[model samples]
Target: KAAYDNQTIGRGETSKSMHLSAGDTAKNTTINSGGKQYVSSGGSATSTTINIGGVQHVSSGGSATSSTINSGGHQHVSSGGSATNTTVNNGGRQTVFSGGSAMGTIINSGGDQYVISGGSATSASVTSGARQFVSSGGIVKATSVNSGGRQYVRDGGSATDTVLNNTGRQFVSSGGSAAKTTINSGGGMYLYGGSATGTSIYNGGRQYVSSGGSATNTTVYSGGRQHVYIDGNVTETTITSGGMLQVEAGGSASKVIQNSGGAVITNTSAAVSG
Candidate 1:
């Protein structure tokens, strides 16, 4: 008898004013489970917080796969379930389930991606734009995020082979694992932020960070490659053992630091300092 919530909260009987329940055959109409209530596909209060907290079974005679959810709300895909081609806007949150594919997910300003399991997003994006929060447990695949957006890859998480092009003011911490994870002019990326390993990063496109970036504990290995393009200011950063830090022709890190573990600090020109 396991229980879960968006955070640490208790459950009880459904309260109408704050919770909306989802019935098995209640198709077409939108469903909203309670914020402080126990809801399931089989079950809300006055709360607009819709909790899709359970397995959404696709009954044989039912054709409700393309159900659309639209609102400035928070939707929780807690536990295991399935949904396809769904587009939700900002001022909302889309949670996780590490089992199947929660395909075609689109996010916006106030929107965020909270991957709570080891689920692989075959097709997910910050297409609408966000400082995506990818953690809990999962791999961010084929996902595109904005430069001004912050990214986090903690324990039980891995970020690889992804696209990140942004500006100033981004909080990126890779305390788990990063591979093929690209960061631009305003970036360098952390390999061992906490306990990260086997990751990579490199500029493959017009991956440029015009100004202000940092790469602390940048490393090179199976998938750890950090690179600063030739047109940015990457200052006050550190590159630890086995970490590869590249400063391109137009890139510069005013106060860069390195450790013993074989740190590769190369520059296309005299673009990197410190």
Candidate 2:
């Protein structure tokens, strides 16, 4: 059935499917098990609740706002679609396809957000046990990761202006990139492949560049540490007072500037220049 003009579908129904098209609006809808809501081009849905076994699809040109996805629920935003202020609870999953955008999303424990190729996610908050994945060609901006949260940038993906709090972690895979990241106390950034740049590590924060990884133009502040493991490379790094840089065997550092009170520790097989 088609729903329009503030109609609610699936509230007392199960396994039902409701479609909304251009100029159609659905508000305060509750989808139960086996139910589905489809928002087509120009369609909009607000304050929708997707319960277990429920699903919501926002097609190109469609939009969904203030949606809550509970356990076993799923929300899929197609290319050109948009979703804002979404809350994904435990066992919930949200996917943003190519050209899709999601903003102000809150991912709680056991929740997940996936940004596929060409998709973008902005101003997302990832809490404990939650994760956000940026796949190839995907971009994430201004994301905040709290304790026990994680952000993963896969091949060809990029994340910028991310803030990591206590126990938060960000990982950059091969061919991936992260820039302008701020790691606060007890936070960490790990690069197993690809590159990280313009990162700021504050007190008790750490950045690790492992084999096949590289870091450049990073600033390490007091009580912060930067570790370059074997086969890793670091360049143009600035170590401030109380900061420490460690280059392990087979690791290399170039153009590193160590200010007064900064420390650089290198293994016998490590290389340092400039």
Candidate 3:
């Protein structure tokens, strides 16, 4: 960096090798670096955007976490428009100093967080207060509009789709268990389609809230199809015997269709109580 007139040297170095502070300006430009830093900001234009330092380091052992990052030649953010906003800061330090933090982080402080969704993904994630579905260890809760776990809803299909579990331990757990179990435990509900309106769960009402937690379940066929449909009000709705609600034969078939304000369906292996 060298400038004559009024003097302007955007960047240089100590011992050597460090370039990037060249600017002629266009709109809003930024160049940022932290710790063992290596930053560049010249310009090739076309709404230039570039970001790196992605090995994971979002510490808050000191509490100050925030993320909605996007900096691309593309787009993403709640939903993507045209990308260009990269911010991965760890100003709330924990350990591993300087080039620290990230070794595939699991914990450093308290409330811990872990999200692993590489590639195909979309979420509005719901599995709250009860009305359940959850996965273990790494823990995952699900409330769906669409999903494919082992994953597969198209292309020859095999990874299985529709999942809403509850029986011995899970289906809805922020507060679930007035259940004797029944929405179709022996077999009822699980369907898929090519057209038939492209597989359905229909309208609404499949809710159980208050997170006290209880219900254990099973369905290991590993693919969509198991029909259930109990129209409107549905027997009044409740499941808590070992808490059963199955659609287990497989999914290109099995089905559930509960409509007409119809609610209340039971089967705790065949239940008879609270």
Candidate 4:
């Protein structure tokens, strides 16, 4: 049976490959192992399930919604393509290339999401054992990293308004940037050769700036700690009561305000002013 405009590819039906062109729509499609579905520009796919070994490709201007990607399945969104409410299960993978975007994605254990250069991701929830990678020129906004989840921003990548829960971690690598990050209790933020701005560290949370890293306008709350390692720099920091700021040797801190009961510890050779 031909799968094309206004057609429905139901369960148990296997089509080696199906192409959806402009003005075409595929609904409730089930893609099994070795099967492939292509959604070209102006095409749409809804409520599709990609099983193990299945592949779904959405080209520019194409769209997919409510997709369920099972183990070994793969979904690739090219420039101008979009995916919404995608659920990636264990061993599943979703990749968004330049100009592509994904929204409201849920990444489960062992699932992986990649936002390549010029790609964007919004409102993604990364759960335990899930991983999200933002490469150069990539952008991610409003991501929630839960316990055991990790988000990595590589060189030239940027992430904004990220929330890190207990046991969650965010790593900003060289040339990367993170803005308005909130670190809750037991969460951690690590910057290596990158920069972070407007960070809020709550009780029991920690922010670490390594060599070549910098943090600005950071607010450390009670029971929180900010650590600046060798060659790291921090400025405009507000240390609240019970908070602590540690500047190791070769690290520098300026424009720091220590509230009552806050502690500032500077090691030998550390530069601390204001």
Candidate 5:
């Protein structure tokens, strides 16, 4: 239906075109389609490409060596290579590596940069230079005003590593509701060489870390275990700005259970949900 009106293209014309070879063209070739169907070199408006069903929207260069694969949802935007060519909606939302720009810079080559949501991510930010991370979330935020940004979390191997300041995820939420993180051109989150003693911190609500200039924050080594929960009143979890909160408990009988209601008691890899 070569439609018009307000484009109510409800199907109205004589149709029967599936095509069978009309290839051969290199000179002054052009095609136009109002209801869809075009092929070739000059449909002007500086035409380059615009394939629909077969999904090909070229910006430059003339090449479409088909093996065919399509399904671009989860809302996407691409510039060059990996930052995550297209991972729309597998984990739910937002996974754009280097060449994948939501804002820019998602260049992951090593591993462990995950944002898995069962419900409640809402937003996750990333800008890298020297980084590390980990989050079994409901909420995880990263802000790198881009200088030499770095982050890591142990007892959890950090969101996934190169090493900057270290404070993986120390939680809290309520009245003083300030569990936030910001690498405003610097970095820190403790655990650089020594005591991570008895790390156990599980969260349902707060975890904030910060860094600016000659930045610093460390929890030394072997500290890991923390599970947090709190829905009302207050007292969730927090490790201040120069962040460092490790509870320790690796291998055997674990301990360090803080509660208000959302139950927790762990040590095999803590990130509680029940």
Candidate 6:
């Protein structure tokens, strides 16, 4: 049941296969080794670990509870149950299907990770070359992406209290919202098709908005820049020294463009929308 090198379950029977060799199979349950390792069972794995440099799998009632993984590998959790109090590390292509509920932290380091709509994660943290995709209304408590990584919040999915640091790219669209967000970078950010509220960009970061979106109480500073298209509305905007703000035709803003000391505040909002 635990730490088994090779295992198999009988028809309509149940067992746990742990530390199994590679490409192992559980058919109705069958045991076929593929020169690697795996796991499959009808019960729970408490304080269990499936390795990288190897392979592990569970299906149709295979679940992990109170488990932890560090410096990740490849894993598939589907058609079974949820992962409660589990710690999943980054790397090796991971997916959480409709039956998966991540109640712990998923750390990504230079790997590609994804969470589906029916699959919800407590907090997902990414650093250095990782890419994360949240779709189908996946609700993440908080998200952090840094160091040239990428995160996409799409299809009405929401990433609350999100923070981006140093050259990460984020796309929120198709009704997705990167809400309560902060962006700090020398590159830039784009919300041309999403909603950015209570957003802030600083230190060479630029914000661009085009259509069907709005930015409220947005602040730009230290050479930050903002460009709003005619179909967008930017209100309660502030620009500090070395910052620049521009609005195209049909865009609107509060009449007050607070520019202090070499800051550029262009109030083209009133003339276009008035």
Q: Which tens-of-lDDT digit does each residue in 1-274 have in candidate 4?
A: 2334333332345447778888788888877777888988888888888878888898988999988888989999889899999999898999888999999999999998998878999988999999999988989999999999999999988999999999999999999999999999988999998899999999989999999999999999999999999999999999999998999999999999999998899987437876
TM-score each candidate: 0.50, 0.94, 0.23, 0.92, 0.22, 0.65
Expressed as tens digits, the lDDT of each residue in 1-274 for candidate 6 is 2333223432232443334222332222222222122334454444444344433453545655544443444445554545555445555545666656555545456565567756666656666667777788666656666766677777776676677777876776757776667777754456757777777777767677768766777777766777777777677777766676777666555533556652544445253221
Q: Higher-TM-score candidate among 1 and 3?
A: 1
- In order, what lDDT does every prediction score? 0.44, 0.90, 0.21, 0.89, 0.23, 0.58
CA-RMSD of model 3: 16.2
Among the numbered candidates, top lDDT falls to: 2
Candidate 1 regions off by >4 Å? 1-28, 32-72, 78-80, 98-100, 166-174, 183-274
lDDT of candidate 5 over 46-103, digit per residue (tens): 1111111222221111111111111221221122211212212112223322222222
Q: After superposition, how far is residue 13 of candidate 4 from its true place, in Å?
A: 6.3
For every model shown, the clashing-pair count is 38, 0, 73, 0, 51, 7
Give residue 150's lDDT in candidate 2 (0 to 100).
Answer: 96
Q: Taking the tens digit of each residue's C-alpha lDDT, what string does model 3 give over 36-145? A: 11122331112211122111121212111122212211111111111122222222111122211122111111111221221111121212121112112112222122
User: What tens-digit string does per-residue lDDT give for candidate 1 at 1-274?
Assistant: 3222323221343322222235322323334443232334433111122333311222212222333333433444544444455454554555555653456566655566666576555455565355455665676665555544445666667666555554412233434555545554344343333332222333322222333333433333322345565444444445556545566666665555565663545656466555
Instruction: Give per-residue CA lDDT, model 2, range 15-46, as digits (tens).
Output: 38878888888888887777889988989899
Order of the predicted models by TM-score, top scorer first: 2, 4, 6, 1, 3, 5
**Which 10 consecutive residues of model 4 have the lowest summed lDDT?**
1-10
Candidate 4 residue runs with Cα over 4 Å from true position: 1-13
As a whole number from 0 to 100, the lDDT of residue 8 in candidate 6 is: 40
Each prediction's RMSD over C-alphas, in Å, is: 10.9, 2.2, 16.2, 2.7, 16.0, 7.1
Candidate 3 residues lying further than 4 Å off, grouped into runs, are 1-56, 71-136, 140-274
